[PDB]
Structures are given as structure tokens and as C-alpha cells.
Design a protein around this ligand. Sequence first.
Ligand SMILES: O=c1ccn([C@@H]2O[C@H](COP(=O)(O)OP(=O)(O)O)[C@@H](O)[C@H]2O)c(=O)[nH]1
Ligand SMILES: *[C@H]1O[C@H](CO)[C@H](O)[C@H](O)[C@H]1NC(C)=O
Ligand SMILES: [Mn+2]
Ligand SMILES: [Mn+2]
Lengths: 527, 6
Amino acid sequence: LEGAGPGRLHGRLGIKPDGQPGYTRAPSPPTDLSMPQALARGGGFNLYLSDHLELDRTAPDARHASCRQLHYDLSTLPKASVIIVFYNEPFSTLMRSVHSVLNGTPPQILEELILVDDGSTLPYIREDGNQQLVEYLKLLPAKVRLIRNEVRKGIVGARMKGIRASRAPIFAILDSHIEVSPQWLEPLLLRIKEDSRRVVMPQIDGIDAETFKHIAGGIGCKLGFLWKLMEHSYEGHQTARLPPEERQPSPTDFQTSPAMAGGLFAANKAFFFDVGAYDEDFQFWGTENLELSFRLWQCGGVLECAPCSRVYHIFRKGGSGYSSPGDSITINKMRTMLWMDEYADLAWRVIGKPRVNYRPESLEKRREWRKRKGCKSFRWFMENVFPEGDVVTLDDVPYLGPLRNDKIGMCLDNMGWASPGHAVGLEYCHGGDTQTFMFFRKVGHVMPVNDDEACLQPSGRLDWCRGTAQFWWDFTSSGQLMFRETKQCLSAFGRKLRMVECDDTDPYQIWSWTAYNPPDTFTFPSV
Amino acid sequence: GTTPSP
Ligand SMILES: O=c1ccn([C@@H]2O[C@H](COP(=O)(O)OP(=O)(O)O)[C@@H](O)[C@H]2O)c(=O)[nH]1
Ligand SMILES: *[C@H]1O[C@H](CO)[C@H](O)[C@H](O)[C@H]1NC(C)=O
Ligand SMILES: [Mn+2]
Ligand SMILES: [Mn+2]
């Protein structure tokens, strides 16, 4: 296209032959707008405002100053394919992503821009509808190509389709609702150029779902995972466990990460297929980011984060852009547990000892692949990749089970909500997950099994876990739950949890807690 | 869905 230059690196996009934009911006959002209603209409973000905002939307440069002092020889860098998959993404957000990539990516290093319709049902996206998308693409460069999935396959199914169509040596995956900062692709290509085993991910920034403001700081560089099988950014007490030379790293140095946030990463195409690509039995939205990350490290790969590659992302708030089956997320977590070896016992209990159809036949074929590849163990992963975790070995979970007081013959009970912010009760013991708690010794945390983010407090309530003395309990040899700071013990006198002076002679402050002596091998549940 | 860091 014509009109290229700074800020419009592929030329002026989306312009009819008459010099007029092919897209009419909506009027300003109505003054009387109930944000909860609008967040639930646009699928987790204010669509009224998005439809009013320009597609060539200027974004603040979120990169640190030292990142802008770096130079790249675009002739020596390999070209890449950008892959944006989407299911029923609105026109404004999807095309703003396209314009942002085209305007912000030098053409010398962008082989193509693949758009994958994961079986969308919206009229503007359908080939039996109003044909808005196809028509507007004619006003974009030919690098942009639209491929379509006959039926909604899911994230893994759509990404694999785009990767298998990409023709560049390197590919980069991006969500359909993003805005890039300057020189976002160049630092990633340089990393993969020097080692095809490196999978490099940008640092994710924020676009407020309600106001669409750009927020510096989304998902940092170093992130681990929760035993609910979920990516989780390093916390303070965890970054403190890092080697002293890695706690305040340089703004430009690349940092390894045990896990990725998902769907914003770049990789060498050939290595991606040799290291397992994706497990295509994953369904819809899910935890493919953790299955990839574990397998990546264990099978001879390196996951790192490029602090100088920043991309803005709309984190959905108060709504969801699509509806996925309820059993899909459970299945993806079961398949992910193949790579966790004995540690899968803890994850299985945290997600509720589920018993679904995790496609056992397919997973066996990947256990073989894992063996023929020589992949390393999850113990190795924890002791070498994520050694800063609160549970490096299952011996860090000494107790898992009911917390019973034999004097009153009752067990602690999360009362129907392992979520933080509610009081814990005392109820007759019944042997359900609502009355099973776990202990993490590295941090002194007493949590319900179904949420490792919920920590018991001397207030008798659960609150968000923090690696501080505000949540450090000691389980004495006498059976007392002692709070370290206050040096008081937890009592069940009067069927009301209270803190009292420690006294092993007081039966109301003596608790029993089942020891967690897991097996050495996790046997998957029968289907 | 994915959530930002605190
Ligand atoms: O069945 C699906 C679900 C999602 N997506 C796309 O995959 C990306 C990641 O999904 P989402 O943004 O909902 O994940 P989140 O960032 O909310 O965790 C988005 O571009 C979605 O449109 C897709 O192509 N098919
Ligand atoms: C986002 O917030 C949720 C809250 O339950 C989890 O803590 C999740 O681990 C967070 N994700 C990241 C990237 O830290
Ligand atoms: Mn997203
Ligand atoms: Mn945390």
C-alpha cells in the first residue's frame, strides 16, 4: 500500500479507492451506559467505546528507555508469520489488532499475517453473512490472509491451523484484541535467530476493558503456576528466592520463565513441531499454555521473556467473549497432569479429584512420545526450572486432609466457598473436600485443598495467600495450630474458632491432621 | 480467562 512511513509501516490501511475509510467509527458511547450491561454485551469489554475508537489508534510506548537504545539489522533477521486466531471477535477489536501489527511491524520482517476464523457465527465474519470482514480485507495489504475453520475447534485447533499454513521460518501468535508497542517483533526474532530452541514471549500490558486506557504492567516476565493448574506471576517471597544476581535484572536482559501466560509467544516453526507443538486433543479454551511450558522445558527447550517486546492486551472483566463446554477445561487439566509425574496427585486433589473423559487413548500416545524424546521429569522441572516454588517436592506438603478437634468431634469446614474472604466453620466430619485442608511448609500456609490462593488467618477466615508472617502457621508436635507472629494457638472452644494462649493441656486447641504421604507414581483415574 | 498480575 501507499503512504508508508513512521507509524504506518505498511502504508495507510483500510482506505477505499475514493480516499474514504472503509470503516465508519461509531458515535461516542451513550451517556447513560450501565457498564455491567455493556461488559456483558461486548463479551468482557465495552464494545460501544471500541466501536468509537479509531483503528489507527496511537498507543504509549510502554518499553523502558534502555530498550529504545537498541538497533536491529532487519536484513539479517529472519522473516516471521503473525497468526491471529479468533472466535466471534468484534470487528473493531480484531481490525485494531491488524492495524496495530501492520503499522508497527517493519515489512522487511513480516512474511504474512494469518487470520484464522475458528468457526465464527457472527454475521460480519461468516461467509454466508454480510461479508464485512472479507470486503475490508481487500483494503489491506496482500500479506494479510484469512483462513477459516469449518467448525469451532478451539484455541489449539485454530493456532495449529495457522502454524501449519505459515510459510516463514518463525511464527508469532497474538490474541485478536491487542495493541503493540514499538519494535515488538524485532527483539523476539533476534533471540530465536541465535537459538531455534528458544521460545520467546513478549511482556503483556493492559487495555482496560471498561475505559480502554493503556495500563503499563500486565503480566511480567517471571511466572510460575498454581496447583489449580493456572499461570501465576512470581510473588515477592518467590522472587526473593531467586539467585541474588537475578532479583533485579537489567531492563533489557532476557529472563527465563517456568511458564507462559498463553497465546503471546514466538517460536521457530521447525522446533515447535519437533518439541510436540500442541496436544491437539485439547478442547476449546484451557490450560494449553502449561502443557506447552512443562513439555517445552522437559524436552530440550527454553522459555524466556523479552522485556523489550511489549504488547497491550484486553483482559476480560465482568464477562466472557464466548462460551466453552464445562468439561473442556477439566479435560485439558487432566491431560496436562501427564507431564507432572508424581506431582499430579496434588493437582488432581486441588481441582476436585475429577473423573472425566480425558481421551486416555490419545494421552497414552503422548506418554510414548515423551519417553522416545527423552524428556526430563517434573521433579527436575521443579528443582531446576521453578525451584522458587512453594512446593518443590511433595515433602513440602506434609499434611493434607481434615483438621479435626476430637474434643468437640468436629472438622474445619470452608462452608461452601474455598474462595478468599469468608469465615471458616466447625461442622461434624463427613469426609468431603469442603473439610480437607493442606499445609505448605515453606510458607506456613493453611489452605483449603480446592484453592491454594486461600489462606487461613487468625481471624478465623480465609484470605488471599501472601508469603508474609500474616499467614504463617506452625503445626506443633502436640497438634496445635500456632500463629507465629502472635504466638497464640487456634481453639475450637464453643464451636467458635478463637485464638488462645498455647497450652498442650487444653484439648480444645489440639488438632489432628492427616499426613500427606502420596505415592511415587500417579495412576490416572479410570474413564 | 487469563487475569493480570496483582
Ligand atoms: O474457541 C476459541 C476460543 C478462543 N479463541 C481465540 O483465542 C484467543 C485467546 O482467547 P481469550 O482471549 O479468550 O483468552 P484469555 O486472554 O481471555 O485468557 C482469542 O483471540 C480468541 O478469540 C479461538 O480462536 N477459539
Ligand atoms: C490472575 O489472577 C488469578 C486470581 O485467581 C490468579 O491469581 C492467576 O494466577 C493470576 N494470573 C497471573 C498471570 O498471575
Ligand atoms: Mn485474550
Ligand atoms: Mn499469589
